[PDB]
Design an enzyme around this catalytic site. Structure first.
Site, PDB file in Angstrom:
ATOM      1  N   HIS A   7     -20.485   7.418  22.465  1.00 56.36           N
ATOM      2  CA  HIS A   7     -21.106   6.105  22.674  1.00 56.36           C
ATOM      3  C   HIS A   7     -20.062   5.020  22.845  1.00 56.36           C
ATOM      4  O   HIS A   7     -18.901   5.249  22.573  1.00 56.36           O
ATOM      5  CB  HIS A   7     -22.048   5.723  21.547  1.00 56.36           C
ATOM      6  CG  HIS A   7     -21.459   5.561  20.182  1.00 56.36           C
ATOM      7  ND1 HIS A   7     -21.392   6.630  19.291  1.00 56.36           N
ATOM      8  CD2 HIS A   7     -21.008   4.471  19.512  1.00 56.36           C
ATOM      9  CE1 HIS A   7     -20.962   6.185  18.128  1.00 56.36           C
ATOM     10  NE2 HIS A   7     -20.681   4.888  18.232  1.00 56.36           N
ATOM     11  N   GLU A  43     -28.556  -1.981  14.471  1.00 60.24           N
ATOM     12  CA  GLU A  43     -28.095  -1.207  15.654  1.00 60.24           C
ATOM     13  C   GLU A  43     -29.275  -0.768  16.492  1.00 60.24           C
ATOM     14  O   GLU A  43     -30.397  -0.550  15.988  1.00 60.24           O
ATOM     15  CB  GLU A  43     -27.294  -0.029  15.093  1.00 60.24           C
ATOM     16  CG  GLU A  43     -27.248   1.191  15.939  1.00 60.24           C
ATOM     17  CD  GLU A  43     -26.649   2.399  15.223  1.00 60.24           C
ATOM     18  OE1 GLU A  43     -25.971   2.213  14.200  1.00 60.24           O
ATOM     19  OE2 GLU A  43     -26.842   3.499  15.717  1.00 60.24           O
ATOM     20  N   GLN A  60     -24.310   1.770  21.986  1.00 60.87           N
ATOM     21  CA  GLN A  60     -24.622   1.411  20.602  1.00 60.87           C
ATOM     22  C   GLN A  60     -24.519  -0.106  20.484  1.00 60.87           C
ATOM     23  O   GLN A  60     -23.371  -0.572  20.360  1.00 60.87           O
ATOM     24  CB  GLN A  60     -23.661   2.154  19.684  1.00 60.87           C
ATOM     25  CG  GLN A  60     -23.903   1.883  18.237  1.00 60.87           C
ATOM     26  CD  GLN A  60     -23.066   2.750  17.351  1.00 60.87           C
ATOM     27  OE1 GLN A  60     -21.890   2.440  17.127  1.00 60.87           O
ATOM     28  NE2 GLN A  60     -23.685   3.791  16.807  1.00 60.87           N
ATOM     29  N   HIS A  84     -15.972  -0.894  20.152  1.00 62.75           N
ATOM     30  CA  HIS A  84     -15.293   0.391  19.896  1.00 62.75           C
ATOM     31  C   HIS A  84     -15.770   1.428  20.898  1.00 62.75           C
ATOM     32  O   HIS A  84     -16.804   1.161  21.563  1.00 62.75           O
ATOM     33  CB  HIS A  84     -15.515   0.879  18.454  1.00 62.75           C
ATOM     34  CG  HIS A  84     -16.923   1.227  18.079  1.00 62.75           C
ATOM     35  ND1 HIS A  84     -17.784   0.307  17.490  1.00 62.75           N
ATOM     36  CD2 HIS A  84     -17.570   2.400  18.057  1.00 62.75           C
ATOM     37  CE1 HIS A  84     -18.913   0.902  17.192  1.00 62.75           C
ATOM     38  NE2 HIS A  84     -18.829   2.141  17.551  1.00 62.75           N
ATOM     39  N   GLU A 134     -13.850   5.784  17.342  1.00 65.22           N
ATOM     40  CA  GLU A 134     -14.731   6.477  16.410  1.00 65.22           C
ATOM     41  C   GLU A 134     -14.789   7.952  16.797  1.00 65.22           C
ATOM     42  O   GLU A 134     -14.721   8.250  17.984  1.00 65.22           O
ATOM     43  CB  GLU A 134     -16.117   5.863  16.451  1.00 65.22           C
ATOM     44  CG  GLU A 134     -17.050   6.379  15.400  1.00 65.22           C
ATOM     45  CD  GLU A 134     -18.456   5.811  15.455  1.00 65.22           C
ATOM     46  OE1 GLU A 134     -18.595   4.724  16.018  1.00 65.22           O
ATOM     47  OE2 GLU A 134     -19.431   6.507  15.021  1.00 65.22           O
TER      48      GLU A 134
END
Ligand SMILES: CC(C)(COP(=O)(O)OP(=O)(O)OC[C@H]1O[C@@H](n2cnc3c(N)ncnc32)[C@H](O)[C@@H]1OP(=O)(O)O)[C@@H](O)C(=O)NCCC(=O)NCCCC(=O)O
Ligand SMILES: CC(C)(COP(=O)(O)OP(=O)(O)OC[C@H]1O[C@@H](n2cnc3c(N)ncnc32)[C@H](O)[C@@H]1OP(=O)(O)O)[C@@H](O)C(=O)NCCC(=O)NCCCC(=O)O
Ligand SMILES: [Co+2]
Ligand SMILES: [Co+2]
Lengths: 144, 144
Positions: A7, A43, A60, A84, A134
């Site tokens: 994501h 989220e 996301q 991210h 991540e």
């Protein structure tokens, strides 16, 4: 092994407005919504495609629940935008230990809960050429 | 229709160092390299996965060829990090006209050349909640 882009984490001031933007503009629909009090985010996951490792790729969208949070501090400094990127793996624990052994800072000793029961960890952006990175293993095991 | 995440555009000061970072850390290999003088970038594409629409998802690493360029100006202001996200479509011309008709600024009248002969356009980040958004149709038509 990191087998997909899982994501893109996108910070926004207003989750409902930004969700509507993505729906109206591109036809992307909400796959899932949740609040993660530990992380300090509300989220929405928007599924864009499935992937060749049996997983999927999402946007996301993240609105902070509090200013004193990773996303709240980032939004205050940088305004809305990409926060991210996340890579998927079948074994976040093993891939995180391999990366720790290269001298890249792994932010969690042990993976923490992410979206949809996933297990996640993060790499420090200053060790990744400015990208907060991540690592995620989905809660449901995937058939390539 | 936008059927995949095509790539994440990542700005870096030194393409060779950043390519090596991604190889050493994650085992990602170089799919393609090229220079785009019009855009002012030296680029490396790293393929992370294939996608359910018959395409693929990449990291697009970009070093500027000149300070007076989209990426050169961005790096000077923000330092290394995520520069843009790209969605794939089988018809960038048609999807760009639909998005133009919603009042989102489409930066090119007609799609321009991207990586590997692709045809690309961009949406203004201030119209996209702070995300510079690329639309791309691959040069080779894809079998879902
Ligand atoms: C990454 C970091 C430790 C940053 O925390 P912290 O160091 O306290 O904030 P900071 O403002 O002092 O940043 C330190 C440096 O990192 C940079 N930075 C911070 N967040 C960044 C990000 N998202 N991307 C890139 N660089 C980042 C800062 O600009 C700063 O750089 P300088 O030295 O140039 O000032 C922290 O945000 C963190 O732990 N993040 C991981 C958890 C998270 O992001 N959760 C939200 C998402 C949840 C989910 O995806 O499920
Ligand atoms: C997007 C834009 C028109 C920005 O140009 P410009 O307006 O001249 O630079 P700028 O510094 O004045 O930015 C205007 C605003 O956009 C914001 N911005 C600029 N680049 C941004 C980006 N990559 N992401 C998010 N916001 C961006 C700036 O911060 C500025 O915001 P403020 O009003 O808050 O200052 C321009 O970079 C562009 O045309 N980009 C598309 C082409 C491109 O990026 N090519 C490189 C990649 C090639 C490829 O992927 O193949
Ligand atoms: Co995330
Ligand atoms: Co691009």
């Amino acid at each position: 092994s990191l087998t997909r882009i899982d994501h893109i984490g996108i910070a926004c001031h207003d989750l409902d407005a930004t969700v509507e933007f993505y729906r109206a503009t591109y036809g992307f629909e909400v796959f899932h919504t949740e609040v993660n009090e530990e992380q300090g985010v509300r989220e929405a996951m928007l599924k864009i495609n499935d992937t060749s490792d049996g997983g999927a790729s999402y946007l996301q969208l993240l609105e902070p629940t509090r200013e004193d949070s990773a996303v709240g501090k980032w939004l205050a400094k940088n305004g809305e935008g990409v926060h991210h990127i996340a890579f998927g793996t079948a074994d976040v624990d093993a891939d995180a230990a391999d990366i720790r052994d290269k001298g890249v800072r792994v932010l969690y000793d042990e993976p923490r809960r992410g979206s949809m029961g996933s297990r996640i960890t993060f790499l420090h952006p200053k060790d990744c050429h400015g990208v907060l990175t991540e690592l995620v293993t989905s809660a449901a095991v995937e058939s390539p």
